[PDB]
Design a protein around this ligand. Structure first.
Ligand SMILES: [Mg+2]
Ligand SMILES: [Mg+2]
Ligand SMILES: [Mg+2]
Ligand SMILES: [Mg+2]
Ligand SMILES: [Mg+2]
Ligand SMILES: [Mg+2]
Ligand SMILES: [Mg+2]
Ligand SMILES: [Mg+2]
Ligand SMILES: [Mg+2]
Ligand SMILES: [Mg+2]
Ligand SMILES: [Mg+2]
Ligand SMILES: [Mg+2]
Ligand SMILES: [Mg+2]
Ligand SMILES: [Mg+2]
Ligand SMILES: [Mg+2]
Ligand SMILES: [Mg+2]
Ligand SMILES: [Mg+2]
Lengths: 129, 153, 150, 141
RNA sequence: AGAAGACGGUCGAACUUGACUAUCUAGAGGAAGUAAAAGUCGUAACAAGGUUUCCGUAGGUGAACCUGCGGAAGGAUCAUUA
RNA sequence: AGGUUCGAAGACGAUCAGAUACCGUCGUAGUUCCGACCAUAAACGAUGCCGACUGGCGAUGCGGCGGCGUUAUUCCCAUGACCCGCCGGGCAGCUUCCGGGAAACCAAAGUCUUUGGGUUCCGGGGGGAGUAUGGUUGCAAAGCUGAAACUUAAAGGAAUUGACGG
RNA sequence: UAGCGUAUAUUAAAGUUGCUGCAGUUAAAAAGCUCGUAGUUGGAUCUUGGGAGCGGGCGUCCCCGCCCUCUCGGCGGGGCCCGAAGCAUUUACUUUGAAAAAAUUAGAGUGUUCAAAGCAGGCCCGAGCCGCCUGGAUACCGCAGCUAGGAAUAAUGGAAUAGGA
RNA sequence: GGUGACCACGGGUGACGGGGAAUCAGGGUUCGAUUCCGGAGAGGGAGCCUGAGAAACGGCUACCACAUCCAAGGAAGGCAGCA
């Protein structure tokens, strides 16, 4: 009934960012969510975040900065080769100057610039700009 | 029950049974010698093939087939049709336009030697390619792996 | 929502964060197991044993006291029920509806509800078959189910 | 919505072809009823023999007599009606002449105020109709 | 050493007959749809269209249609008072 | 089985140029019950189901929790009637530059070129036509599945101004 | 413009077939309603920061080396050493390596007099010069199969009547 | 026994397959009888001889369909090779 926790997390982030809010509670937590948020936070689009440990799946309270436009997900995790990364960059990103595609590779969860740097492909998680 | 259930005498062609059995031997117990071979590719000969008494001329260990070509795998679905079973091989077929997959399957009939005794539906078998053994059989069972079992009620 | 109802109800138990046994509970693990054994020999289900132990003995969760769960304790003692209790109760309800329905043949609502109950029985039995709790040849037969239940 | 699953290619492709049968052009091209019904049989032109000279009244609000001919094709000898376009070009065509006939522009659809006419005459017996109209050549007499 | 020839077997064209199947085609008569309408008869619908309209079902009548039983508002009422 | 009342068909009386109608009088089948068929409705919210997020407000129905007081038995604690709130699940309402939409409008019909949560059914200009034919279900009436030839340049939706309205 | 018109098939236009990427209140379009098997999809959780020198600057960034196993090591028992065997699941995925005819396509070189082409050509001769230099590359070749690294994501497996290591 | 809603079996194709061709954001939609590779056939079916190799057709035998010469007893045919 909830097939994707990353999709719902990024939708909640997107909706509350569009409403002008300053913090978001992301209700079910997972480490894919944490790695995605760590990429987004290292690139400067969101602020600090805090994981709340109950003995079920946790919760995350994210601090927003006002620098986020759209953080959507790609609904099947399509397997992407390095040859095809340009095509996804053109379809998904608003320009060649900013915006990132988050892949999961065997080297970890990372943005597409780092994935081209480390000469690896993987499955696409989502985008943000 | 016995192995001689056919109209012709069943024997391994490379074993001479009438080797001048004289008074210096015991009557009994005598046990006629068994021909078996080691197939390559790191596949162990089962012990039931070593001291079994079956005669099977299409058995990869005690018969006249040689394994060469492709090594495949599948799941047992039918165990009728004596000394032969039907396995199912599932796979995903890529379709470029929708850049997604679809699920396909193929059955092949394989020869199951009687050195594999406890084989059930749902078991995973390893098959090796041999020469054509019948109209539709081209593979031969080399190894049987049980699936989620080994414990019963 | 519900499997076979249009209900989006949200009511359930909220287990607390602290898993430690409270200091006021002067009951160790083995005598709590003995209470479990007594109640199970009295003919109670694990739900009922947990309800009684919570209501009038101070044991909020036996998993935090003993270390494992009620049905595991009963199985280790060798006196766990032969059918799972939820499948048992579903079959009991099906038998009640079927008996009512054969004396009242114009109840089309009960016919609809019996269809729902038996669908739930079959889904549950398929699950228990995959987990080897039921024999693989087990089958809910309506004609012989009443001799199994109540 | 549509199914997006990674293993849903068969559902997507089967649905697409089942739904491709629902547009007019794909069905017209791929069913074969239209190819059997039209007199040219997939050809672009055809030869025939004039049976009589007719005039068809134009559709309202226009008012004229459009000069046509009744033509029976040499292969598959169906009978069609073909327009004879220009100001005096009907007088060139004599009865029992042997014309070439083309489409009239809209791929088997009627054109203009001429009701039910899908063909036009090009090259009444072998001298072309434009050369006859422009005086370039004359009837082979 | 052996040719013609012959009994049998085996492949088996072809012909006759029968069935099935696909395509194309004749037909007294009947019943439609499009048109060209610029005829005759009425006025069913669009306004409360002069009986509010429409759906399902059933019967009836030159024709549009009418009537019965349930339903809808896409109604001509978002409303009617202790 | 039963048939009170209504009342398709039918008869008559009116009205009308006509009136197989509307109005009036009578009246069959039916309407009612039991048993068996039929599977259709503007069977409608003309809005698939499951899940998440995104404003405010006042009510209402059920359950629970908590509070000044009033009232009942009874004199007390309950328990009912009311009053003031909170939580959950419902049927709805008002309001809003959330956002959307061709607009009417819609807190979902939003979170859509900044386009991907899962999944089923289904449309592809108007007609011909839900027709022909084959199949299949039914006692029938009919239901389901379902073309083509041919024809046509618009048919439609929502709003605006006028004109007209028994 | 030495060419231009017409007929027809087909592609773009067509986000009017929609995977990317359309629609379904009122425009055409959600099955009357519920159950249900294939099909499709399915919650969270098991290794992470300090680690070893080269280390995009131990410079609190880090090319990057992580501070799998053992029976013969073959450079019955000495340090200089490395191979015979196997993988503590098996897959998908990703990167690499082999193999995928030529032609065609992309593309390097080369003044066909330019070009479309072609696969050719270029340099000294005061003449023995009894001739010298150079090319005829490279890429791409879906899926399936083979191979070697990674191991996040997704599937899967091991001890519960212990028939466990 | 074997196969099948992961579409068997049957029917159609104005279907020889492929390398490739047209279109041209990315996706895709159409086309490929046609000089290279593979297949198949020599009017239609069938059967053979010889040879390493053919079920050969610029080999033979037979039937069917066309068809040539004849003194009417017979005889000879095969352009989907180049013209
Ligand atoms: Mg959805
Ligand atoms: Mg009316
Ligand atoms: Mg009227
Ligand atoms: Mg009216
Ligand atoms: Mg009356
Ligand atoms: Mg009735
Ligand atoms: Mg249409
Ligand atoms: Mg197109
Ligand atoms: Mg559209
Ligand atoms: Mg509509
Ligand atoms: Mg299912
Ligand atoms: Mg998961
Ligand atoms: Mg052909
Ligand atoms: Mg070809
Ligand atoms: Mg060839
Ligand atoms: Mg041949
Ligand atoms: Mg031949």
């Amino acid at each position: 009934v909830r097939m994707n926790v990353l999709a719902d997390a990024l939708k909640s982030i997107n909706n509350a960012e569009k409403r002008g809010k300053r913090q978001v509670l992301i209700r079910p937590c997972s480490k894919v969510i944490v790695r995605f948020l760590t990429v987004m936070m290292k690139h400067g689009y969101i602020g600090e975040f805090e994981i709340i440990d109950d003995h079920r799946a946790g919760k995350i309270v994210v601090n927003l900065t006002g620098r986020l436009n759209k953080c959507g997900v790609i609904s099947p995790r399509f397997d992407v080769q390095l040859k095809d990364l340009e095509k996804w960059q053109n379809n998904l990103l608003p320009s060649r100057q900013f915006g990132f595609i988050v892949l999961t590779t065997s080297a970890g969860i990372m943005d597409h610039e780092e994935a081209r740097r480390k000469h690896t492909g993987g499955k696409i998680l989502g985008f943000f700009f | 029950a016995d192995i001689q259930t056919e109209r012709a005498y069943q024997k391994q062609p490379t074993i001479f049974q009438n080797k001048k059995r004289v008074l210096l031997g015991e009557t009994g117990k005598e046990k006629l010698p068994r021909y078996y071979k080691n197939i390559g590719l790191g596949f162990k000969t089962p012990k039931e093939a070593i001291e079994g008494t079956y005669i099977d001329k299409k058995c990869p260990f005690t018969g006249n087939v040689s394994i060469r070509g492709r090594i495949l795998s599948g799941v047992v679905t039918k165990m009728k049709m004596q000394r032969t079973i039907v396995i199912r091989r599932d796979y995903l077929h890529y379709i470029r336009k929708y850049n997604r997959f679809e699920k396909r399957h193929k059955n092949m009939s394989v020869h199951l030697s009687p050195c594999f005794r406890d084989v059930q539906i749902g078991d995973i078998v390893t098959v090796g390619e041999c020469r054509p053994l019948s109209k539709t059989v081209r593979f031969n069972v080399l190894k049987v792996t049980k699936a989620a079992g080994t414990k019963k009620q | 929502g519900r499997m076979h109802a249009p209900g989006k109800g949200l009511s359930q138990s909220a287990l607390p964060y602290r898993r430690s046994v409270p200091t006021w509970l002067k009951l160790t693990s083995d005598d709590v197991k003995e209470q479990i054994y007594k109640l199970a020999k009295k003919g109670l289900t694990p739900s009922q044993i947990g309800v009684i132990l919570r209501d009038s003995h101070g044991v909020a969760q036996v998993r935090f006291v003993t270390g494992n769960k009620i049905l595991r304790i009963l199985k280790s003692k060798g006196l766990a029920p032969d059918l799972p209790e939820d499948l048992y109760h579903l079959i009991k309800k099906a038998v009640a509806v079927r008996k009512h329905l054969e004396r009242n043949r114009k109840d089309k609502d009960a016919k609809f509800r019996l269809i729902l109950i038996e669908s739930r029985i079959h889904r549950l039995a398929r699950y228990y078959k995959t987990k080897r709790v039921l024999p693989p040849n087990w089958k809910y037969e309506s004609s012989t189910a009443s001799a199994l239940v109540a | 919505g549509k199914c997006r699953g990674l293993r849903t290619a068969r559902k997507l492709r089967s649905h697409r072809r089942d739904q491709k049968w629902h547009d007019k052009q794909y069905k017209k091209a791929h069913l074969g009823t239209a190819l059997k019904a039209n007199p040219f049989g997939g050809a672009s032109h055809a030869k025939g023999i004039v049976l009589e000279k007719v005039g068809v009244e134009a559709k309202q609000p226009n008012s004229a007599i459009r000069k046509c001919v009744r033509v029976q094709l040499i292969k598959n000898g169906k009978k069609i009606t073909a327009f004879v376009p220009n100001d005096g070009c009907l007088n060139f065509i004599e009865e029992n002449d042997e014309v070439l006939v083309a489409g009239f522009g809209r791929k088997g659809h009627a054109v203009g105020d001429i009701p039910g006419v899908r063909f036009k005459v090009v090259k009444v017996a072998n001298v072309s109709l434009l050369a006859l109209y422009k005086g370039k050549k004359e009837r082979p007499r």
